[PDB]
Design a protein around this ligand. Sequence first.
Ligand SMILES: [Mg+2]
Ligand SMILES: [Mg+2]
Ligand SMILES: [Mg+2]
Ligand SMILES: [Mg+2]
Ligand SMILES: [Mg+2]
Ligand SMILES: [Mg+2]
Ligand SMILES: [Mg+2]
Lengths: 172, 136, 197, 190, 106
Amino acid sequence: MAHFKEYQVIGRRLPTESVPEPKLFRMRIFASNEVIAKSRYWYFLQKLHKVKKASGEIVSINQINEAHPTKVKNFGVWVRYDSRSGTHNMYKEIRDVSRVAAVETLYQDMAARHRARFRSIHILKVAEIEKTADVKRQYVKQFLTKDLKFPLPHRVQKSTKTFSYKRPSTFY
Amino acid sequence: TDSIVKASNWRLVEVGRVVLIKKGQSAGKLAAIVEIIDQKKVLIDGPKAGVPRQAINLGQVVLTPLTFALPRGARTATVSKKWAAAAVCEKWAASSWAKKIAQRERRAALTDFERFQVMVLRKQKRYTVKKALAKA
Amino acid sequence: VEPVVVIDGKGHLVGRLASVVAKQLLNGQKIVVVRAEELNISGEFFRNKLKYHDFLRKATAFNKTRGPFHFRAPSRIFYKALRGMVSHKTARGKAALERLKVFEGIPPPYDKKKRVVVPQALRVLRLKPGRKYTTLGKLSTSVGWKYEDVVAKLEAKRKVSSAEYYAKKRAFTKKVASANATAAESDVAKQLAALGY
Amino acid sequence: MKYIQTEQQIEVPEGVTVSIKSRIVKVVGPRGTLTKNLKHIDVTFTKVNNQLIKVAVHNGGRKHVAALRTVKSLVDNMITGVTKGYKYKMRYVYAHFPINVNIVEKDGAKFIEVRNFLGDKKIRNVPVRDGVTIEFSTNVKDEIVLSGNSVEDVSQNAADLQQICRVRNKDIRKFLDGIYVSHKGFITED
Amino acid sequence: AESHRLYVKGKHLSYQRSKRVNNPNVSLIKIEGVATPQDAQFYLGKRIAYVYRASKEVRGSKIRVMWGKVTRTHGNSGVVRATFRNNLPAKTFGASVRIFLYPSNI
RNA sequence: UUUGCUCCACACAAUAUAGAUGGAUACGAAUAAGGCGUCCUUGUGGCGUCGCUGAACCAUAGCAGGCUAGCAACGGUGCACUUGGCGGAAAGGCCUUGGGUGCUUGCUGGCGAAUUGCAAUGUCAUUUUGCGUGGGGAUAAAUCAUUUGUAUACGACUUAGA
RNA sequence: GAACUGGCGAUGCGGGAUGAACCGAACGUAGAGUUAAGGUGCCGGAAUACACGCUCAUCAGACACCACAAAAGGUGUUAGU
Ligand SMILES: [Mg+2]
Ligand SMILES: [Mg+2]
Ligand SMILES: [Mg+2]
Ligand SMILES: [Mg+2]
Ligand SMILES: [Mg+2]
Ligand SMILES: [Mg+2]
Ligand SMILES: [Mg+2]
């Protein structure tokens, strides 16, 4: 699940005699595989237009890879989610190197802070923020400062053995 | 008359910091931090040693005391050029940390005959060491 | 590996150490634990004192001498934690329990034996910095342990004797390392370096 | 939110030296020396230019940075204590019974002795802490001055003196009698 | 020399079991110096001896042996499963067994 | 009270093993800090170095380890005999001094091994006990019965008696 | 007290500590392999696994049936409008 891929799914109503060549609606879906991608596509087309899987067709599904996977970006993410007593819209910022990884982090973060499962979340929009001074969240802005450098105090080293003879230290 | 405060130096998570990967497909190679993603993730690059440019968790690597000048977000070619210019490889090889690692593989690669020769040489060295330890 | 393992209980977390020791004894390793009074429990002292008072108030209603027994000494609090982690009502669990000795301080002959630590139960490695923790000797004293001061006096004089032993050993180590320095750049040393030694 | 780096600055005057081992702080000034143990905070101290000490917290939460600013205030208070010292002035408030306050020795130990508080027969005793000097101020009525190098000891001793004279079983809005801290300042203040 | 060992030290931990049912036909052996199934794979098929002493001489000896072999790895921490011609007595939970270097593939 | 009891040594026999199979290899503190070395004006000092695991260190070769000849150094180890010093938390161990007596793989030789037959723990430890041998050592009590009443249902307790 | 279906009764086995009915799965005698539900600090077979966060409770919390909790409130702390 969290090993997310991004798919474009393009579908349409089933062609008839009155309206051949329907309008080829397309979405970008974050999903673990194509089966889930197609299901999410039909769920959203179901909710937005008067169409369903039985009366429709999937013309194309394509994985969309990151253009520059090794370029650290800042992502604005607009989501809509269901809490225990209502529905809410949220905006969040993720510093990450790809859209699928940023969406992974978003789902982990929504699960952690709002106990919102994948079931309850609609990804409205994921967009790279083109430049700084547009980053609105301090938890992301604090990593954009010039010559940023920080230590990692209290390093804990994993032991391969039950017993140690040396009283380990945490220097780093 | 002079205020004295213990420094408590730490290796800093910073661009140009050399890290030693300890788990993964690299698992024992040097890489450079090219850009910081967050408190737990950084983007690293190991072009000379064959470490692909990748976002990694800081728990997968150990910071070394080695640093070199590197602009933030430098691409693979310039990382390689500045790594070679700074001569990171032999500055790493000269440290006793790398010497200890090399000693560990050399010991692991020994044969039974070589281990017997090690025993014989150790006894020969021990004879002279004990002799001098008794003299002085 | 060694026939008897002596664990310095200072700075360890009681439950994680007890789990490790229980598995060792059940697997057949002989364990001696020293300095039980320096064991740690996570959580503040008042909270762990409240927990022990809850334990104290549990007793057989019609006869208190047959009820749950409330041992106050740090070594016995650790022993109690290790029980319940061991199936003590069986012969195998009893056999595992005779493989264990727990002490306050470091009595002889263990005071001249090598002590080990269990890193996966060490407080400094396990607890998040800033989390409050309790010390077992202090909790035991507040509960009714009588021998904190005599243990502290014996630990102080043991530490003195150990310090002179360490000074002698450090001097001998310095001269041994000096002799090994003179052995370098010789042919035997060069060959040993080539072979990995 | 786990701020990357929070930092505060400590200014050290010319005649003061600060020696900070791991978290044991020693401040020596013209008026004496003070020591504080700070091994419960997890901060980092850095010396800059013999007049400036930086104190920092890395990857710290809201409570951690609050403690950082508390540490800066504590070290500043020790520096102020060795430079100019602390002085607390307390006044005697009474309606009918003159509160008699004196300094007595029980056995080599200074005690503040309070008598006739609300006409009581009980003599109240308050130990005098080390480094705290007591003086009964002339040229102003019913005032007692506590002075010392540590604001902690001076303020705590003054608080003990105030709390030893609490009224029981009366409307304290009416029976306002007691010994109250009237002024918190420095010894040499200008 | 002072060392004559030609086997690897092992400890008999328990039978194969669920929470409340055990299988005496399969024993679980912890081999010293083995921490992963990958390392335990070297020991698959190696012969195992449980060596114990008895008061009664039988065939010129007071020493008796129970023979078995390593059959597969067990878990994630280098424990192995072993089968013996006669099952281990189960008072030997925690006793020492010997894993020999034969049959050898090196 | 059978020539009983006890300690030491070796000889045999029995008994068992919660499980030897190179070595349990000793600072204390902190961990947002330390260890070690060095220097000074001796400190919360300067400088250097180290860790990132014990994957270490020490031991490790010889009919399960024989017999024998040398070379080189005066070291390393074992055994008793020793001179002391320290150790009471459960000391029961640690540090020593001086000769003797073996071994030495630090380095060169010479002789032996086989047939356990292609593997079978292939037996090399150590609780305890008894029967013997030869060398020291010591020479009582308790209970019943009687008796007291500071005790007492009976046991028990508490007293007395060559 | 009715409706449909599946069960128990008439049924053991693995899991839910424990339990007629829940989950998994139904049963000749054995061997081997693989799993279900449930689990993998120790009791106890199996990662003191890996990863991102949250929480410190002077009455924390810790897996459905199930062995309860509410209106209301808090510059505790986190995210968000
Ligand atoms: Mg009592
Ligand atoms: Mg019926
Ligand atoms: Mg239940
Ligand atoms: Mg059941
Ligand atoms: Mg169902
Ligand atoms: Mg569990
Ligand atoms: Mg287990």
